[PDB]
Amino acid sequence: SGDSDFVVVANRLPIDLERTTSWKRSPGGLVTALEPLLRRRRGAWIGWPGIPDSDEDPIVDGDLVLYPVRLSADDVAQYYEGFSNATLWPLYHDVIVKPIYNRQWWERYVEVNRRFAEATSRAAARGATVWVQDYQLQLVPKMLRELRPDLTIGFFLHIPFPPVELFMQLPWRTEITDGLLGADLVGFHLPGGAQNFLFLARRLVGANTSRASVGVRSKFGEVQIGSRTVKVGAFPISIDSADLDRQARQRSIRQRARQIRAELGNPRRILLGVDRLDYTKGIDVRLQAFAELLAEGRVNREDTVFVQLATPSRERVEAYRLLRDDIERQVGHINGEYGEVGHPVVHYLHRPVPREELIAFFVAADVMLVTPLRDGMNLVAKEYVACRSDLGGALVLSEFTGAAAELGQAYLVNPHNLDHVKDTMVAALNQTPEEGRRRMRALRRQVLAHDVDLWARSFLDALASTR
Amino acid sequence: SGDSDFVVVANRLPIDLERTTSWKRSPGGLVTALEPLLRRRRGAWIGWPGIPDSDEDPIVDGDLVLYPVRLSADDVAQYYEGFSNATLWPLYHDVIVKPIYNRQWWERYVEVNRRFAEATSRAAARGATVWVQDYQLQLVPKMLRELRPDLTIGFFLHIPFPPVELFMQLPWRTEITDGLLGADLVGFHLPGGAQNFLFLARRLVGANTSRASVGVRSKFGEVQIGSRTVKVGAFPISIDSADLDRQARQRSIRQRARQIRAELGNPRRILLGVDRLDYTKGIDVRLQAFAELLAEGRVNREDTVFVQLATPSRERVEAYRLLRDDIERQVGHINGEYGEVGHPVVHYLHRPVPREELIAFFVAADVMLVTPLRDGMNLVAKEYVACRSDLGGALVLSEFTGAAAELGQAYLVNPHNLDHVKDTMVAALNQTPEEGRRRMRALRRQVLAHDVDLWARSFLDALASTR
Amino acid sequence: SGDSDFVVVANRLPIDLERTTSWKRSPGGLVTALEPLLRRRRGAWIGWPGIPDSDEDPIVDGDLVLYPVRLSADDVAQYYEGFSNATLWPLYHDVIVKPIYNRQWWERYVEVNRRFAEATSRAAARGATVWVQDYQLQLVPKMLRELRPDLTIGFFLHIPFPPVELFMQLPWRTEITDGLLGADLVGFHLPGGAQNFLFLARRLVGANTSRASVGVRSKFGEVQIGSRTVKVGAFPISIDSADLDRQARQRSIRQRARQIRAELGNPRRILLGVDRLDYTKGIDVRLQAFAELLAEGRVNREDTVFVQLATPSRERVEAYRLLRDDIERQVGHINGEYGEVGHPVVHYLHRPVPREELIAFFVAADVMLVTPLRDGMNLVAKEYVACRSDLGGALVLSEFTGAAAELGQAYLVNPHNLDHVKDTMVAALNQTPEEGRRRMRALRRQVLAHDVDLWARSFLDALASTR
Amino acid sequence: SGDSDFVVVANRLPIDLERTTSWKRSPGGLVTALEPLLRRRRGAWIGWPGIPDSDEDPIVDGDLVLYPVRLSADDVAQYYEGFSNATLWPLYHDVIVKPIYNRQWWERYVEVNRRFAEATSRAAARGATVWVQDYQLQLVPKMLRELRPDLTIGFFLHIPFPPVELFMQLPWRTEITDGLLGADLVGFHLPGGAQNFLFLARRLVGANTSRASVGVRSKFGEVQIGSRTVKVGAFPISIDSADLDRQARQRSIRQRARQIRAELGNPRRILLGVDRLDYTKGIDVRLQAFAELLAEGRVNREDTVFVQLATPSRERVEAYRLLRDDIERQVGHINGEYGEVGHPVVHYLHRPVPREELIAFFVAADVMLVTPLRDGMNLVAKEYVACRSDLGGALVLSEFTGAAAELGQAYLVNPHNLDHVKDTMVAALNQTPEEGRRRMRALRRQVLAHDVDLWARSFLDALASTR
Ligand SMILES: Nc1ncnc2c1ncn2[C@@H]1O[C@H](COP(=O)(O)OP(=O)(O)O)[C@@H](O)[C@H]1O
Ligand SMILES: Nc1ncnc2c1ncn2[C@@H]1O[C@H](COP(=O)(O)OP(=O)(O)O)[C@@H](O)[C@H]1O
Ligand SMILES: Nc1ncnc2c1ncn2[C@@H]1O[C@H](COP(=O)(O)OP(=O)(O)O)[C@@H](O)[C@H]1O
Ligand SMILES: Nc1ncnc2c1ncn2[C@@H]1O[C@H](COP(=O)(O)OP(=O)(O)O)[C@@H](O)[C@H]1O
Ligand SMILES: O=P(O)(O)OC[C@H]1O[C@H](O)[C@H](O)[C@@H](O)[C@@H]1O
Ligand SMILES: O=P(O)(O)OC[C@H]1O[C@H](O)[C@H](O)[C@@H](O)[C@@H]1O
Ligand SMILES: O=P(O)(O)OC[C@H]1O[C@H](O)[C@H](O)[C@@H](O)[C@@H]1O
Ligand SMILES: O=P(O)(O)OC[C@H]1O[C@H](O)[C@H](O)[C@@H](O)[C@@H]1O
């Protein structure tokens, strides 16, 4: 029973309650991609409203119906801050930080996944399509299948799927793999993730799998699980490109971008970073590179400025606190060394910026610095590109983002190679107008054609074909 | 020119000079495997004598001729402590510790590799066979080929070759890969390493490669490099099994093992660890597991004792210093909590133990704890097995060692799963005599048949076939 | 109202409840000194039973009546772990650790002090004598005077009173001083403490004070506070010397001391440390000194052994956790370097030892190592002396203990001067029998004559004279 | 022999060589006070030119003759960075940081002191007056007296002299005290320092001393040392007040102060800090206080700004590196939380500012924040006062500076009491014009009358009287 023929399930709702109450837009690219999707398409969205011990009364946000899931304080600590973001997040991002393996966290993760599955069953009509999202909910597909074998179940992982050598560290590796194999379709951004999953299915579970490489939105892999076949595919996520492109063309935004440059004392060049404050994002790398370019006199400290817009994220997790301390030290250091009173070389904001203000920064920025150590996709890169209909700008992009597989005309860097990052920043800052416009035209052709609608259609058509 | 038809090249000589002078046996399993080899087989051995600014006068150690390579203090700091053991070692072992990427270290690594290549050329006769060993010398095969295209060149990596996702971090990834591809044969312990290398050769270099899985000592892969073909294979290293087996049978060693038990106050059960003090070895894991078993009263603190024999290693490297501090804290902690005055539960020695004393500990030990987080092979596991001709004992072995692929009848553990480690230690401590003997007989059948002679013959026959 | 003519108030009761319930003897020298006192003398004892949220039902422990004070979990965290032991304790011991100044902790400290005052008033008969103990309760005398101006109130500080330059850091310096000035008599171990308090009363409060030096149990100072005069004195605390001396003579204890030496493999020399695991105690100093003597070959690692008996203390306070980690590291380090399997050079126990076992260790020990960085008195030094009626042994004693002012015939050291500590340990280990006996006879003459009865009589006679 | 009748000896020359060569003004208040002195008065100045392995060729800087002292790299590391600034500096400033006691450092300190003494003897004529400066050179007076008993020798300590309880930690306490007692006159900023020294002379040396309090520039103490009497006094150092006052009146400086306010976007209120980046200076305290006032909305983040001018100091000393990291973190943090792009709330410069630019900042600043945890005097406070002939401004001053004993009309704070610091900053920011001018007039009366000339005359008249 349940009234919805199409249900999305994620740890996040598109809204986030702030503590007296107040709704804000939820952070992260998962919401950035899925929100415009569910605003245009009928369907229900199940998720946590971002505070402990909330109501579970349905919330109507416009045309969209949200079903909130209650998490206790202990749930938030052990399932969300703990297993999800201090076990899985670091492990799947190439153990950039040492994962913590904790059995109590695992037990809570199982409990919460069960709660999400049950909530899904209550929302889902007979024979509904259910699309489960991301690493917090990897047990839900198997749990949901056991409760509701009538459902068609898709799972998409929004973060990298790590190499088998690292995944095998997880004490609950088999349970996680079994969880994912409960879906009819398991999707990843990149073929590499899909292939890691297929190999894992062979070694760990001993299931028969396809042995061919996986294509992009094509040439799907398969895993045989007794009576069932699980389809495996790569579907690189994107943004609502055309909408953002139109938004960035507004006179007010173009005016605001000019004002931002005026407020910065009309620099010749503005470099911009935009990220959650997360250790995967390489904010420390871009600051170090900028610092060394200033030290070497390869960037002019009088007419070049870097703006970093960092959103606070997962702040109770100790690794994130330590990262914040390190980034803020770099900011103070660089300004102390190269700034003047009344004129910093680095402007750093530790807050979410309103959407239209963010777009104005994209339009103002001569160089976009997107330097993650590892990122499943990175939508900030694609957002910048969509905003530059003027064909100005330059995107400096880490090759360890999923986006680099699509945005080859960007200035690609190995963020571990600081000399390469430094050389490339100089190249982007000094590019000719024609070379800049050539690259930006090429990037925009890709991003405008490969949008979130193409992504969702591809995944859901593949999911439907399992019926 | 040069007089030797067969030359081995490694950072280590089999001897190590201590600072007044004194020769000691060199540490590590590379010397453990290669020393008995070169004692029986004609050939020269090029390597560093373990001190800065040594002579380069040839050294005759028995029948064996050694050609020492001089390293300056800066060479030792930047090539050996730096690039080799603070860049490559952590990276190739699944970034257990964060690698440091430093261009000065790279430049020194290149310089030293060049020196080893030149030294090799001087020793090597026209058309000689040269066998280059391990991660410190990955540039030597290409360098040597350019100096001496008449030579047949083999390379063997004694440590894991990491997944492509991690290897690609290395700023000098291409130069390292090109270096290895200078060999006629590149060998790894395991098919997994060989397969990682083949994939890497495809993505990074763009060379045509075989696509099939690689066998054990068979079904070799190939990489096409313009005019040349490079063979790629898996050859799991081992020990001089029969010799060690005979050594362990000596009356004096059996008597010493009984005395060791007496000196420990005749415990019912002795657990033993033997390793270099290296963060890959999981000494912290086995101590934590023992501590928790004592806390839970699952091991009897009155009649069960753990002996850890740790060899100081790479002590100037800060990560190794921090590891030592942590291990020594665990030792003091556990004894403070569960020991009595005059009766520790953990005995910890931070020194190399003489060979016959080590063998006596192997014979005394009811349970061998070999719990690395990652190990290319681990010869300690195989040494224990070779020593237990009495068929007593139990081997607890991490699945993240190369040895686990051969020693399946051991008690295998995921060292990240502390509950699994704890449960398994209890199982080994309480095994029936018949189950213990069954496993030990099976392990010994494997280790006695698959010895260092089989390994070397397999590699060298494959190398010879490239002529 | 209240039934007792004599009431002692301290944060500790002589008993400590362990978490299922169980009574143990309370830690610390305050209980060591006051327990035998109150067992012989009529009177009530008010204090906290060592667990959160206890009953406040009166407890009869032998002839002694105890009135427990309830502390909530927050009280324990903010008043006891917080203000008392992370603000006052480090500050008064020469900021060995950085004090934390926290207003919430202060507010809780005030609240709890009020509760102790009220509890005291309920126990105290009209015109009773009340003796308030130590740094946790410095506000109680003023609070109690305001509730009960009929009472005669004494306060004794069991820890050092710091130099004015450090005391003045305290944001609540004036409130603390006013608190103490509520007493009729304020006592310290040493004239130096009394003199620091007098100076403080002059600068901080602006009260007229005596300007002369303060004597030992004589030549008291005075502070004029409007209508009242507060007497200030030095009264060095001690132990029940004669009782301990008789206890140590028992055949069983002498036999146990011989057995302990046998269990240690009959060493020629035993060094002993006995302390709470507290950063004031210099356990790290004595271990470093021992380590360096072994390294230098000035102590024989085959026949000399160090035993450290450390009682866990204030374990939730982070500074204490960090100290434990450091001490346990030193223990593991020293044994790894100089021990043999089956023969440590350091035996370390992290538990309270039963009294008769402790006495046996005192009797067994050739050298007693009492090396605090700062200690109000240190009763362990005096206990050792009382136990050695055989006149054997040697006391190595830091000059930064209050006991050093009385035990001048001990081997005094500056614990900050590691060479001095090392030289002195060698001197004590190699003393002639006659020199050892001469010193021990002199120390015992002092300790047997200056016992806890002399201390209490001196303080209480001075207090009575204020009536 | 030697040509000068008056010689000053200090670790610093008034000039500092930068590494290619370049002379800069030396840092610190010792040079700020002594430079104008020696520019007006005949005499020689012996000191180190701020680089290792310099010439010792005499340097003529204007009318002033400088005799440089050569220090080797090891001298700089062990005498200057080591004993002086990682042993004495933290110890004498109330062990704000844990002192390191190292015998090699002591031995180097002795050697270097000997070199300074010998250099002094070569410069000093028969019967000359020699004035030795500060904690780096405490052994020189005794050394110089032994070489040259004809000389009249003064010593002045520019940093606090710590309470006896802390000074006694020093393993070389007696040698240091003997060193100072080689002078005819030993001077300190404050009576408290002089009194600590007298007590120390009694306990440690056992010399007869005066027992009375010491006056300001009067009522001197005395220490009897066999045949000699050593005078002890308090002489609070100051600046060349009238000269600085006149300098600050220049039109260009007043214009620059207006421009600085314009460059900051014309804030209503500017707070200013000026210090060496030293852990004694409480830069962390003022930043924390500002941060919390912003969080609490007690300061307007739109029209109030803080400028911190920090001079890099002793940067190779690890404690100073850790301080820099912490301060720079606070700067980045506060701006990230409360700033806007193009508008920081904290401007931080990590460089020495030219004198006339510094004076312009003093004139611009509505509130001067001088919040040391401990400072011998602090001349920045007096400089600010001398600059405000307009009678504007407000000085917020830690009571743990020597200057607080003279500048009582400043807004005094206990920097450990963050609520007090916060309340006081608000009071200073919101003072009435008349109250501000009243305080500033009072402060200026003091500083203009009590200048460096009064200080030097007082010390030198006292020194002359010993002849
Ligand atoms: N400081 C910020 N202010 C406003 N929006 C931000 C900020 N940082 C990130 N975002 C937004 O969050 C989303 C990030 O998505 P993505 O780049 O895929 O990374 P992630 O999902 O890991 O957070 C983007 O839509 C991006 O514009
Ligand atoms: N504490 C020790 N004392 C004596 N020999 C040791 C000690 N620790 C390790 N060894 C020896 O060093 C060699 C280790 O080889 P292996 O297990 O392959 O690891 P690795 O090469 O990484 O050091 C073995 O021959 C082993 O017996
Ligand atoms: N490990 C221990 N086992 C048993 N008693 C101990 C232990 N450590 C200290 N004690 C006892 O605690 C008391 C310590 O008193 P004291 O030396 O004045 O120091 P403190 O009061 O600071 O703890 C002594 O009576 C001493 O014998
Ligand atoms: N950032 C700075 N730029 C220029 N001058 C500075 C700076 N910081 C401190 N000074 C100057 O250094 C001297 C500091 O003297 P003082 O306050 O007594 O402290 P200290 O001697 O401990 O450095 C002042 O003359 C002051 O103006
Ligand atoms: O939801 P947060 O923990 O605040 O992080 C925001 C988002 O970060 C990434 O995009 C994750 O893949 C999402 O699952 C997550 O929602
Ligand atoms: O040579 P060390 O740095 O002392 O380490 C000892 C050995 O450790 C491992 O076995 C390495 O694979 C060897 O290359 C190395 O020789
Ligand atoms: O009571 P604890 O915190 O366990 O410490 C034990 C004792 O240590 C010292 O002796 C203190 O002066 C006492 O007040 C305290 O009771
Ligand atoms: O000389 P620096 O180490 O650079 O420090 C600068 C100055 O700081 C303080 O003023 C000291 O009292 C001086 O002796 C010192 O010269």
Phi first, then psi: give them for residue C338, nearest 5 degrees.
-120, -15
Distance CA C307, CA C348 (A): 6
Beta-bridge partners for A311:
A276
Best mutation site among A136, A238, A311, A359 for ligand 1, i.e. most ligand atoms within 8 A of its Cβ? A311
3 state DSSP class of C238:
coil
How would you list the strands of the sheet with B304-311, edge to edge? B346-350, B304-311, B269-276, B367-370, B395-398, B411-413
Nearest ligand (C-alpha, residue B273): 2
The two three-digit tokens of residue D445, written as one number? 């009366």
Closest by CA position to C446, among listed C368, C381, C359: C381
What one-letter code names the amino acid at B117?
A
Q: What is the three-class DSSP state of B391?
A: coil
Do B213 and B272 lie in one domain? The reply is: no
The two tokens of residue B193 are: 């390493």
Closest by CA position to A337, among listed D267, D327, D284: D327
Q: Bridge-partner residues for D412, per DSSP?
A: D397
Q: Which residues pair with D130 in a beta bridge?
A: D7, D153
Closest residue (by CA) to atom 1 of ligand 6? B12
Q: Please report, as a single letter, which amino acid is at residue A201.
A: A
Contacts of A163 in chain B (CB under 8 A): 163-166
Residues C309 and C336 in one domain: yes
Instruction: Give CA–CA dist B345/B304, Å, rounded.
Output: 7
How far apart CA B208 and CA B187 sit, in angstroms, is 18
Q: CA-CA distances (angstroms) from residue A213 to A193, A234, D279?
A: 11, 11, 60
Give the separation between CA D414 and CA A428, rounded to whole angstroms.
52
Domains contained in chain D, number: 2
Burial of C136 (0-12, 13-18, 19+ CB in 10 A): buried
Please classify residue D213 by burial: count the beta carbons closer than 10 Å to its beta carbon, then call 0-12 exposed, 13-18 middle and 19+ buried: middle
CB-ligand 5 contact for A439 (6 Å cutoff): no
- Quote the minimal CA–CA distance from D431 to chain A in Å: 26
DSSP letters for A78-96: IIIIIIIIIIIHHHHTTTS
Q: Which of D110, D115, D168, D101 is nearest to D139 (CA)?
A: D110
Pairing of strands A59-61, A64-68: antiparallel
Q: Does residue B380 sit in helix, strand or coil?
A: helix
Mention every residue, 6+ apart, whose C-beta is less than 8 A from residue A23: A15, A16, A17
Q: Of C96, A409, A143, which Cα lies nearest the Cα of D95?
A: C96
Same domain, yes or no: D64 and D175: yes
- Length of chain D counted residue by residue: 467
Please report which ligand is nearest the Cα atom of C278.
3
Rounded Cα–Cα distance for residues A432 and A413 (Å): 19
Cα(C78) to centroid(ligand 3), Å: 25
Give CA separation, B346 vs B157, B277, B329, C308, in Å: 35, 16, 12, 17
Q: d(Cα D386, Cα D448) in Å, to the nearest integer?
A: 7
* CA atoms of A112 and A106, how far apart (whole Å): 10
Q: Token pair for residue D79?
A: 């005498």
Is residue B305 exposed (0-12), middle (13-18) or buried (19+ Cβ within 10 Å)?
A: buried
Task: Measure CB to CB from residue B420 to each of A162, A171, A420 and give the nearest one.
Answer: A171
Q: What is the dihedral of CA C438, C440, C445, C449, to 10 degrees?
A: 170
The residue among A90, A31, A77 whose CA lies nearest residue A315 is: A77
Residue D24: phi and psi, rounded to 5, are -120, 165
CB atoms within 10 A of CB D400: 25
Which residues in chain D touch residue A339, judged by CB atoms under 8 angstroms apart? Answer: 347-349
CB C62 within 8 A of CB C39: yes
Q: What does each C-alpha distance from D414 to B450, C173, D374, D396, D397 come to in angstroms?
A: 75, 11, 11, 10, 9
What is the Cα D87 distance to its own chain's centre? 17
| Whether residue A93 has its Cβ less than 6 Å from ligand 5 | no
Pairing of strands B64-68, D152-156: unpaired
Q: Residue D140 belongs to what H/E stretch?
A: helix D140-147
Give me the torsion for CA of D37, D40, D44, D46, rounded to 10°. 30
**Which domain CATH number covers C364?**
3.40.50.2000
Pairing state between β A221-225 and A228-234: antiparallel
Contacts of B358 (CB under 8 A, 6+ apart): B274, B309
C-alpha C121/C-alpha B86 separation (Å) is 67
Query: Helices (DSSP H) in B344-451: which residue ranges?
Result: 355-364, 379-387, 418-429, 433-449
Q: Which residues does a 6 A CB cutoff place in the pocket of ligand 2?
A: B 27-30, 32, 274-276, 309-311, 352-353, 358, 377-380, 383
Angle at A283 between CA A280 and CA A285, to 5 degrees: 95
In angstroms, the CA C108 to CA C136 distance is 12
Judge contact between A149 and A27, C-beta under 8 A. Answer: no
**Considering only alpha carbons, which residue of chain B is nearest residue A401?**
B165
Q: What is the atom index within ligand 3 of the atom nearest the CA of C375?
A: 22
Residue entry with tokens 């430094």 = A422
Residue in B143, B144, B150, B142 with CA at minimum distance from that of residue B121: B144
Nearest to C419 by CA among D102, D111, D165, D95: D102
Of A27, A111, A24, nearest to A76 by C-alpha is: A111
Same domain, C318 and C439: yes
Please, what is the end-to-end C-alpha distance for chain A in angstroms? Answer: 19
Report helix angle D379-387 to D433-449, nearest 10: 120
Look at residue C156 and give its three-state secondary structure.
strand
* C37 and C165 housed in the same domain: yes
Cβ-contact A309, A272 below 8 angstroms: yes
Shared domain for C227 and C277, answered yes or no, is no
Of all residues in chain B, the one with the smallest CA distance to A172 is B417
Interacting residues of C218 by C-beta distance below 8 A, sequence separation 6+: none
- Full strand arrangement of the beta sheet holding C411-413: C346-350, C304-311, C269-276, C367-370, C395-398, C411-413
* Alpha carbons A197 and A189: distance in angstroms, whole number: 12
Q: A92-108 in b/e burial notation, b at 16+ Cβ within 10 A?
A: bbbbbbebebbeebbeb
Residue B299 to chain C, least CA–CA distance (Å): 19
Interface test with B, best of A284, A414, A422 (most B CBs within 10 A): A414
Given a contact cutoff of 8 angstroms between Cβ atoms, the answer to whether A29 and A281 are in contact is no
Q: Which of D199, D171, D167 has the alpha carbon at shortest distance from D90?
A: D167
Please give the Cα distance from A148 to D422 (Å, whole number): 61
Q: Which of B263, B328, B339 sits opposite C336 (nearest CB)?
A: B328
Task: Kindly give the distance from the C-alpha atom of residue C36 to the centroid of ligand 7, in angstroms, as a whole number.
Answer: 16
Cβ pair C353, C309 in contact under 8 A: yes
- How many C-beta atoms lie closer than 10 Å to residue D303's C-beta? 11
What is the H or E stretch that residue D37 is in? helix D29-40
CA angle D13, D18, D19 (to 5 degrees): 140
A266 and chain D: CB distance < 8 Å anywhere? Answer: no
Question: Within a 13 Å sphere around the CA of B173, how many CA atoms are in the beta-carbon half?
Answer: 22
Same structural domain for residues B285 and B405? yes
Residue D29 C-alpha from the chain's centroid: 4
Residue A449 touches chain B, beta carbons under 8 Å: no
For residue B32, the CA-to-ligand 2 centroid distance in Å is: 8
Measured between alpha carbons, how far is A222 from A218 in angstroms, rounded to an integer? 12
A243, C378, C401 from C405: Cα distances, Å: 83, 11, 8
Chain C residues with CB under 8 Å of B342 CB are 260, 263-265, 347
Does an interface of 3+ CB pairs under 8 Å exist between C and A? no
The runs of H, that is alpha helices, within D236-317 are 241-247, 251-263, 283-295
Same domain, D230 and D250: no
Cβ contact A332–D330 (<8 Å): yes
Find, among B82, B98, B77, B112, the residue nearest to B169 by Cα: B98
**End-to-end CA distance of chain D, in Å?**
19
Q: Which run of H or E residues covers position D8?
A: strand D4-12
Nearest Cα residue to C113 out of C90, C86, C147, C151: C147
Q: Distance from the CA of D186 to the center of ligand 4, in angstroms?
A: 25
Token pair belonging to A163: 């190499």
**Distances from the Cα of C327 to the Cαs of B184, C310, C334, in angstroms?**
54, 10, 11
Alpha carbons C459 and A207: distance in angstroms, whole number: 83
DSSP category for residue B163: P
CB D130 within 8 A of CB D7: yes
In angstroms, what CA-CA distances link A153 with A361, A372, B431?
Answer: 39, 31, 45
CB D24 within 8 A of CB D145: no
Are residues C442 and C230 in contact, defined by beta-carbon separation less than 8 angstroms?
no
Q: Which helix (H) or strand (E) holds D4?
A: strand D4-12
Same domain, B454 and B401: no
Tell me the two tokens of residue A458.
């591809």
- Gapped junctions in chain D, after residues (C–N > 2.5 Å): 19
Q: Are B225 and B298 in a shared domain?
A: no
Within 10 Å of residue D220's Cβ, how many Cβ atoms? Answer: 18
The reply to whether B293 and B360 lie within a common domain is yes
Length of chain A in terms of residues written: 467
String of DSSP letters for A293-307: HHHTTSS-TTTEEEE
Give the nearest chain D residue to A334 (CA atoms): D328
3-state helix, strand, coil in chain D (%, to 5): 45, 20, 35
Q: Give backbone dihedrals phi and psi of B314, rounded to 5 degrees, phi first.
A: 50, 45
With contact defined as 3+ CB pairs under 8 Å, the chains touching A are: B, D
Positive or negative torsion for Cα D204, D210, D211, D216? negative
E strands within C180-335?
185-188, 221-225, 228-234, 269-276, 304-311
Contact between D341 and A307 using a beta-carbon 8 Å cutoff: yes
Name the method of structure determination: X-ray
Nearest partner of C377 among C355, C411, C351, C407, judged by Cα: C407
Q: Are the beta carbons of D331 and A336 separated by less than 8 Å?
A: yes
Contact A349/D327, CB-based, under 8 Å? Answer: no
The answer, yes or no, to whether any atom of ligand 8 lies below 6 A from the CB of D134, is: yes
Candidates A68, A67, A66, A225; CA nearest to A141 is: A225
Q: Which domain holds residue B333?
A: 241-449
Cβ pair B237, B248 in contact under 8 A:
no
Nearest by Cα to D335 from A345, B394, B171, C71: A345
CA distance D326 to D335: 15
Distance CA C46, CA C24 (A): 17
Documented resolution in Å: 1.7
B1 and B131 assigned to the same domain: yes
Spatial separation of the C-alpha atoms in residues D389 and D383, rounded to whole Å: 11
Cα–Cα distance, B246 to B59 (Å, whole number): 29
H or E stretch including D312? none
Cα–Cα distance for residue pair C305/B264, rounded to 1 Å: 17
Backbone angles phi, psi at B16, to 5 degrees: -135, 125
- Amino acid, single-letter form, for residue C451: D
CB contact, 8 Å: A418 with chain B?
yes
Q: How far apart are CA D5 and CA D124, in angstroms?
A: 6
Dihedrals phi, psi of C308, to nearest 5 degrees: -115, 120
For residue A259, give both structure tokens: 């004002």
